[PDB]
Amino acid sequence: VLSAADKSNVKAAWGKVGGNAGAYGAEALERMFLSFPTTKTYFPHFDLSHGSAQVKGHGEKVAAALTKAVGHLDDLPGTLSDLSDLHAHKLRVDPVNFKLLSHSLLVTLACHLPNDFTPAVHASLDKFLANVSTVLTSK
Amino acid sequence: LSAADKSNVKAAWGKVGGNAGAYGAEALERMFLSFPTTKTYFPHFDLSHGSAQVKGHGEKVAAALTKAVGHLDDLPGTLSDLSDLHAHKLRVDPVNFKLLSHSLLVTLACHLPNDFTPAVHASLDKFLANVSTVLTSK
Amino acid sequence: MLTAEEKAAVTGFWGKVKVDEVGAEALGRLLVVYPWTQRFFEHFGDLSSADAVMNNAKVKAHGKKVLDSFSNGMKHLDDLKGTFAQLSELHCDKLHVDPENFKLLGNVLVVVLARHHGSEFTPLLQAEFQKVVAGVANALAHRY
Amino acid sequence: LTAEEKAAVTGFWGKVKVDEVGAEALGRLLVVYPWTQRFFEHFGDLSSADAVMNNAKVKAHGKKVLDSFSNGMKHLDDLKGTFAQLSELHCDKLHVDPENFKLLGNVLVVVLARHHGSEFTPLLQAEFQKVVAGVANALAHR
Ligand code: HEM
Ligand code: HEM
Ligand code: HEM
Ligand code: HEM
């Protein structure tokens, strides 16, 4: 909730994530979907099988939304205002979903970046992802 | 987080008053009867009903919310000395905060039926939520 | 985890409740206090506000059956599990309500009884009820 | 889960570095979820991340839990029976309430993708996601 050493660890991990962001998101989601199928039901009218144009394309967005987040780290309220709005009021995503997506990022970050994925960066990223999750289910 | 929470949690806390202490104790005691795992964080307390220490400490918990409530803008501000205690030394598991917060919601409801509406009650709950995400965070 | 002595009290007390008001109220509170629960109930029409959600006949209606299930849950107390074995099905494979949400409805129930019964609803007597809701919410999630 | 999977899961599990996988999983937990620390506060120096990662009982406990995590890979049906004895310690003498197992089931799976990279297929998570579910529940029985 979160330390200075956290903001850092985040902006340190996600730099390494780099021009790949797009994909990792795509893979967080994919991995969120075979792993926690009751997640699937938030995307009814949505191609939801391996390698999909949507599964991809939507990832770009999810990932581009943490990219903004990392960037605006200091007031996650005011950067994510439109996304709570969307996940809170309109779509009413059940806070527990924010948190198995959050672990499919971590899992996802983990195999790709073994040497950048230290406990200390793990630590901060749960906190990060835990907190994005909290803004997004707000007001 | 949401003026209209803040608003309500003031009014919430304003009607509670100097019975915050008596409620702190009572929720405390309600926490302990309903959730005995919690006791385990207190083996230095005599815990028999109407213990001095329980009474004493309910006060110290009532009073720390009072603090958290008027000073609601900056939270990891005025409770940094309490995160410290709860996150770091006591290393308190954050599931017990859900337990102790539940219990105040309970006690309040029982002493303040007319002031405890569904809207103020939502607040009180989001509130206690930060209070503990703070107490547990760093 | 419920003695015969622990069983009176909560069976006794329980016929002092306005099961139906109480109920309607839980479900509104649940819905207001935990806004995402509103999903599983988009069909109930308007939930724009605190009051709409409270004065909505179907919240009230649904208010009545769930507390009805506790009542029947209450009658059958050693076999929650199976009294609620069907209502797991509905809640797990079908609407896919996540388990955590049950817990939230119990805690809320509890709050509603403390408001209606004030100090008649003692700390001791609320510890026994916690064992009721827990077991119920344990049971509703069994087919998980 | 149906043998088709009890034996795509065993195939991976045979390839896992069991000694160090447990050590590391148990460190990340204590690190990532800093409160779990107080059940292992008698393990000594948990005073920071390297202290945890390099505290020898964190190491040994890692083993024994991750080996406890093998016996279960054997009896994937009576994961109740297998983990009756450890649900005993955990809920009753140790009190650890069962959100914290899930946590460690998950931290184990974060770890697996660390050691095995792209081989830890999106479809092989889910698999293990189940095991780490049951195993979270095995323990949570009492
Ligand atoms: C780190 C947290 C998350 C972030 C940053 C995020 C980001 C986003 C973004 C950028 C959009 C699209 C907005 C647009 O296109 O303008 C979106 C929409 C959406 N999100 Fe998320 N999301 C998160 C978590 C979740 C979770 C857990 C779920 C459900 C399990 C979810 C479900 C949805 C759905 C269903 C939509 C759009 C509906 C549709 O496109 O059909 N989000 N989110
Ligand atoms: C609403 C959130 C909470 C607040 C505001 C709160 C407040 C306090 C306060 C004011 C103190 C006394 C500090 C002092 O006397 O200098 C304290 C100490 C303590 N609290 Fe908490 N508490 C909260 C949640 C919890 C929970 C859930 C537990 C576990 C059941 C807990 C366990 C303890 C323990 C074991 C002490 C040590 C008391 C002493 O050394 O005299 N707290 N807390
Ligand atoms: C204390 C736990 C709960 C109990 C005992 C309970 C019990 C019931 C009962 C009796 C019904 C109607 C039965 C009938 O008329 O056949 C029902 C239906 C329903 N419940 Fe649950 N409920 C609980 C919690 C929840 C929660 C937490 C949610 C969402 C988060 C939820 C969502 C629904 C929905 C959408 C229905 C629709 C009924 C239908 O199929 O027409 N319930 N439940
Ligand atoms: C679900 C994964 C877990 C596994 C596989 C596991 C396994 C074990 C085993 C086999 C032992 C010692 C048995 C003996 O030789 O008597 C043990 C001890 C212990 N565990 Fe765990 N456990 C798990 C979860 C947890 C969690 C999540 C915590 C902390 C929150 C925890 C805290 C402890 C403590 C405090 C001990 C006592 C150490 C000792 O035996 O000296 N356990 N565990």
PDB file of N, CA and C in Angstrom, chain D residues 5-34:
ATOM      1  N   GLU D   5      -4.833 -36.800 -16.726  1.00  0.00           N
ATOM      2  CA  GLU D   5      -4.158 -35.663 -16.080  1.00  0.00           C
ATOM      3  C   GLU D   5      -3.298 -36.062 -14.871  1.00  0.00           C
ATOM      4  N   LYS D   6      -3.710 -37.086 -14.123  1.00  0.00           N
ATOM      5  CA  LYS D   6      -2.871 -37.613 -13.026  1.00  0.00           C
ATOM      6  C   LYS D   6      -1.483 -38.068 -13.532  1.00  0.00           C
ATOM      7  N   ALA D   7      -1.357 -38.134 -14.858  1.00  0.00           N
ATOM      8  CA  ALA D   7      -0.183 -38.687 -15.509  1.00  0.00           C
ATOM      9  C   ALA D   7       0.280 -37.788 -16.666  1.00  0.00           C
ATOM     10  N   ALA D   8      -0.112 -36.509 -16.594  1.00  0.00           N
ATOM     11  CA  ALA D   8       0.551 -35.402 -17.309  1.00  0.00           C
ATOM     12  C   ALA D   8       1.089 -34.437 -16.252  1.00  0.00           C
ATOM     13  N   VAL D   9       0.684 -34.706 -15.009  1.00  0.00           N
ATOM     14  CA  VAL D   9       1.030 -33.928 -13.826  1.00  0.00           C
ATOM     15  C   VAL D   9       2.205 -34.598 -13.127  1.00  0.00           C
ATOM     16  N   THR D  10       2.235 -35.922 -13.222  1.00  0.00           N
ATOM     17  CA  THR D  10       3.299 -36.723 -12.657  1.00  0.00           C
ATOM     18  C   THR D  10       4.533 -36.535 -13.526  1.00  0.00           C
ATOM     19  N   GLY D  11       4.302 -36.513 -14.834  1.00  0.00           N
ATOM     20  CA  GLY D  11       5.346 -36.244 -15.810  1.00  0.00           C
ATOM     21  C   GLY D  11       6.081 -34.942 -15.576  1.00  0.00           C
ATOM     22  N   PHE D  12       5.357 -33.900 -15.184  1.00  0.00           N
ATOM     23  CA  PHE D  12       6.026 -32.645 -14.863  1.00  0.00           C
ATOM     24  C   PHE D  12       6.732 -32.767 -13.522  1.00  0.00           C
ATOM     25  N   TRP D  13       6.024 -33.343 -12.551  1.00  0.00           N
ATOM     26  CA  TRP D  13       6.457 -33.357 -11.157  1.00  0.00           C
ATOM     27  C   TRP D  13       7.773 -34.095 -10.986  1.00  0.00           C
ATOM     28  N   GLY D  14       7.939 -35.148 -11.777  1.00  0.00           N
ATOM     29  CA  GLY D  14       9.224 -35.839 -11.860  1.00  0.00           C
ATOM     30  C   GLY D  14      10.371 -34.926 -12.284  1.00  0.00           C
ATOM     31  N   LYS D  15      10.068 -33.890 -13.066  1.00  0.00           N
ATOM     32  CA  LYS D  15      11.110 -33.013 -13.605  1.00  0.00           C
ATOM     33  C   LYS D  15      11.462 -31.824 -12.684  1.00  0.00           C
ATOM     34  N   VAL D  16      10.692 -31.665 -11.605  1.00  0.00           N
ATOM     35  CA  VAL D  16      10.801 -30.514 -10.701  1.00  0.00           C
ATOM     36  C   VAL D  16      11.970 -30.683  -9.720  1.00  0.00           C
ATOM     37  N   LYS D  17      12.677 -29.586  -9.438  1.00  0.00           N
ATOM     38  CA  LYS D  17      13.814 -29.595  -8.509  1.00  0.00           C
ATOM     39  C   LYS D  17      13.323 -29.505  -7.047  1.00  0.00           C
ATOM     40  N   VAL D  18      12.852 -30.634  -6.521  1.00  0.00           N
ATOM     41  CA  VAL D  18      12.074 -30.686  -5.265  1.00  0.00           C
ATOM     42  C   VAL D  18      12.729 -30.080  -4.001  1.00  0.00           C
ATOM     43  N   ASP D  19      13.976 -30.474  -3.739  1.00  0.00           N
ATOM     44  CA  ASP D  19      14.803 -29.842  -2.708  1.00  0.00           C
ATOM     45  C   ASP D  19      14.685 -28.300  -2.753  1.00  0.00           C
ATOM     46  N   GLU D  20      15.071 -27.665  -3.865  1.00  0.00           N
ATOM     47  CA  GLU D  20      15.118 -26.190  -3.928  1.00  0.00           C
ATOM     48  C   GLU D  20      13.767 -25.511  -4.245  1.00  0.00           C
ATOM     49  N   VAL D  21      12.834 -26.238  -4.874  1.00  0.00           N
ATOM     50  CA  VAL D  21      11.510 -25.672  -5.227  1.00  0.00           C
ATOM     51  C   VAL D  21      10.722 -25.300  -3.960  1.00  0.00           C
ATOM     52  N   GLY D  22      10.829 -26.152  -2.946  1.00  0.00           N
ATOM     53  CA  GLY D  22      10.137 -25.966  -1.685  1.00  0.00           C
ATOM     54  C   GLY D  22      10.794 -24.855  -0.920  1.00  0.00           C
ATOM     55  N   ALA D  23      12.121 -24.896  -0.862  1.00  0.00           N
ATOM     56  CA  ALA D  23      12.875 -23.863  -0.196  1.00  0.00           C
ATOM     57  C   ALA D  23      12.402 -22.541  -0.736  1.00  0.00           C
ATOM     58  N   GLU D  24      12.508 -22.368  -2.048  1.00  0.00           N
ATOM     59  CA  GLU D  24      12.112 -21.105  -2.662  1.00  0.00           C
ATOM     60  C   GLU D  24      10.620 -20.731  -2.498  1.00  0.00           C
ATOM     61  N   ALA D  25       9.693 -21.663  -2.762  1.00  0.00           N
ATOM     62  CA  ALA D  25       8.276 -21.365  -2.533  1.00  0.00           C
ATOM     63  C   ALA D  25       8.054 -20.831  -1.114  1.00  0.00           C
ATOM     64  N   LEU D  26       8.604 -21.510  -0.102  1.00  0.00           N
ATOM     65  CA  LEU D  26       8.343 -21.155   1.290  1.00  0.00           C
ATOM     66  C   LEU D  26       8.964 -19.812   1.637  1.00  0.00           C
ATOM     67  N   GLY D  27       9.986 -19.416   0.905  1.00  0.00           N
ATOM     68  CA  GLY D  27      10.569 -18.111   1.145  1.00  0.00           C
ATOM     69  C   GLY D  27       9.711 -17.002   0.581  1.00  0.00           C
ATOM     70  N   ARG D  28       9.257 -17.187  -0.660  1.00  0.00           N
ATOM     71  CA  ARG D  28       8.430 -16.182  -1.303  1.00  0.00           C
ATOM     72  C   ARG D  28       7.182 -15.921  -0.502  1.00  0.00           C
ATOM     73  N   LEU D  29       6.445 -16.976  -0.132  1.00  0.00           N
ATOM     74  CA  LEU D  29       5.334 -16.827   0.797  1.00  0.00           C
ATOM     75  C   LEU D  29       5.736 -15.840   1.896  1.00  0.00           C
ATOM     76  N   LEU D  30       6.554 -16.290   2.847  1.00  0.00           N
ATOM     77  CA  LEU D  30       6.969 -15.439   3.978  1.00  0.00           C
ATOM     78  C   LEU D  30       7.351 -14.057   3.480  1.00  0.00           C
ATOM     79  N   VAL D  31       7.866 -13.970   2.262  1.00  0.00           N
ATOM     80  CA  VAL D  31       8.272 -12.654   1.782  1.00  0.00           C
ATOM     81  C   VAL D  31       7.084 -11.838   1.198  1.00  0.00           C
ATOM     82  N   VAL D  32       6.363 -12.453   0.257  1.00  0.00           N
ATOM     83  CA  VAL D  32       5.231 -11.858  -0.477  1.00  0.00           C
ATOM     84  C   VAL D  32       4.029 -11.568   0.447  1.00  0.00           C
ATOM     85  N   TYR D  33       3.828 -12.424   1.455  1.00  0.00           N
ATOM     86  CA  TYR D  33       2.722 -12.270   2.392  1.00  0.00           C
ATOM     87  C   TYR D  33       3.217 -12.126   3.821  1.00  0.00           C
ATOM     88  N   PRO D  34       3.838 -10.966   4.096  1.00  0.00           N
ATOM     89  CA  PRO D  34       4.789 -10.760   5.187  1.00  0.00           C
ATOM     90  C   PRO D  34       4.308 -11.210   6.526  1.00  0.00           C
TER      91      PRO D  34
END
